């Protein structure tokens, strides 16, 4: 991916995070678990539903379009009519296939950027109260109980509070 | 639709495509 996160420094995905597209896995003395990140999953679902609606709205429905009949003395306009019908089909087929190919690439890069944005948000929060251990994990220098973990996932982690409590 | 270019009523646009699947989610990597 263009942003190095998905299939990048975060080596793989989580079948155990079921409530969203991006999120957290935590691990402290009380226990472990997954939790989707609602705010960022929501923003992506906004954009992707918008993307799909955009594709729909641009392909107005085809109304009644039947063929025509020609005599054995009208083959030039018969072939012209065939040329027109075939031509437009070749063009909408190209348009349809190309749009989906290009939008598919952008959609995947979009998800990749969203994961990277989330990781950097947490990194910016924890600063040097935790060790960046690669694979997208932060190892805390202080005890981080469930309330501590919950505050990281809310974006209201308290870097001054824990900077004095390092192990 | 790829069924037929002649249509009566309110139909999808005809294309010659055989596949047109549009990603909504991300790259699926369950086992590493």
């Amino acid at each position, epitope marked *: 991916g263009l942003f190095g996160a998905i299939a990048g420094f975060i080596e793989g995905g989580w079948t155990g995070m*079921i*409530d969203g597209w991006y999120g957290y896995h935590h691990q402290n003395e009380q226990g472990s678990g997954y939790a989707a990140d*609602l705010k960022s*999953t*929501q923003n992506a*679902i*906004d954009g*992707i*539903t*918008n993307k*799909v*609606n955009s594709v*729909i709205e641009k392909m107005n429905t085809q109304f009644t379009a039947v063929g025509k009949e020609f005599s054995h003395l009208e083959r030039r306009i018969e072939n012209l009519n065939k040329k027109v019908d075939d031509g437009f089909i070749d063009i909408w087929t190209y348009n349809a296939e190309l749009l989906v190919l290009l939008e598919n690439e952008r959609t995947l890069d979009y998800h990749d950027s969203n994961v990277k944005t989330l990781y950097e948000k947490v990194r910016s929060q924890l600063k040097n109260n935790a060790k960046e251990i690669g694979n997208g994990c932060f190892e805390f220098y202080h005890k981080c109980d469930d309330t501590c973990m919950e505050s990281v996932k809310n974006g209201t982690y308290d870097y001054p509070k824990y900077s004095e409590e390092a192990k | 639709q790829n069924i037929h270019p002649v249509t009566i009523g309110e139909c999808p646009k005809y294309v010659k495509s055989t596949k047109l699947r549009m990603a*909504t*989610g991300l790259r699926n990597i369950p086992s590493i």
Partner: antibody, heavy 121, light 109 residues
Framework: EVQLVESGAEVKKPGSSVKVSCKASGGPFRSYAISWVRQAPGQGPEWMGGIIPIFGTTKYAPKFQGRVTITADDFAGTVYMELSSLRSEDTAMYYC??????????????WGKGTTVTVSS | VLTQPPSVSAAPGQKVTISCSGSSSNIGNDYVSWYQQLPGTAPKLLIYDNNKRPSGIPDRFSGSKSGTSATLGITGLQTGDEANYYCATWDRRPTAYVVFGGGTKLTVL
């Protein structure tokens, strides 16, 4: 705003099943969940279950767990609700309501006008 | 389930309060919403996330949550405010689901 429009009234016999629908304006894909809530005469609302956009996952209340099936035709901007083994106690007004976001939750901010299902012998 | 008083009454211009009492599985660990219901019409959201109002709900409606009990408040009571009021929340009891209170009928004199 958003308009939720339920399908017509239904009158069905016990043990049969009914499939009502809810058509939403705009879209047709939505970024918010939709659930179904019913309310029997002289009673409070009771949630039945809901469905999540893109993921398509569903949650059902324990009381209807096992005989309710919520589905979605996002291209038609429509959501369906099928309830089976109908009892007389199922006679109520059925509403579809949307949630503020993509997860089903206690907060449903916009409701349809409701449709009635009557279950009698 | 959530328990509310079955019925409360007051004269116009007064302030009433509707209590919603649950357990640690519902109200004590999740947000609380309130709905108003008029005869013949669908439930109308008044309060979400314990104490926030949607657009269009007047200043005199308010809510709060203390530990295990939530509370709806209405001031400047009007004749049009005579309806059924329901609290709702996200119960983690058996399988998680949305649970409504029993309801509270507000009568104006």
């Amino acid at each position: 705003e958003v308009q939720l429009v339920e399908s017509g009234a239904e009158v069905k016999k016990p043990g049969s099943s009914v499939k009502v629908s809810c058509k939403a304006s705009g879209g047709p894909f939505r970024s918010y969940a939709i659930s179904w809530v019913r309310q029997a005469p002289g009673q409070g609302p009771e949630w039945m279950g809901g469905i999540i956009p893109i993921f398509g996952t569903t949650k059902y209340a324990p009381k209807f767990q096992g005989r309710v099936t919520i589905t979605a035709d996002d291209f038609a901007g429509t959501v369906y609700m099928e309830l089976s083994s109908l009892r007389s106690e199922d006679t109520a007004m059925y509403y579809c309501a949307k949630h503020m976001g993509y997860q089903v939750r206690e907060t449903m901010d916009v409701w349809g006008k409701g449709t009635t299902v009557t279950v009698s012998s | 389930v959530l328990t509310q008083p079955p019925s409360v009454s007051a004269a116009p211009g007064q302030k009433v309060t509707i209590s919603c009492s649950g357990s640690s599985s519902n109200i004590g660990n999740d947000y609380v919403s309130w709905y108003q219901q008029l005869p013949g019409t669908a439930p109308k959201l008044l309060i979400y996330d314990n104490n926030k109002r949607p657009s269009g709900i007047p200043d005199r409606f308010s809510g709060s949550k203390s530990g295990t009990s939530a509370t709806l408040g209405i001031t400047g009571l009007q004749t049009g405010d005579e309806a059924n009021y329901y609290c709702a929340t996200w119960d983690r009891r058996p399988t998680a689901y949305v649970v409504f209170g029993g309801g509270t009928k507000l009568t104006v004199l």
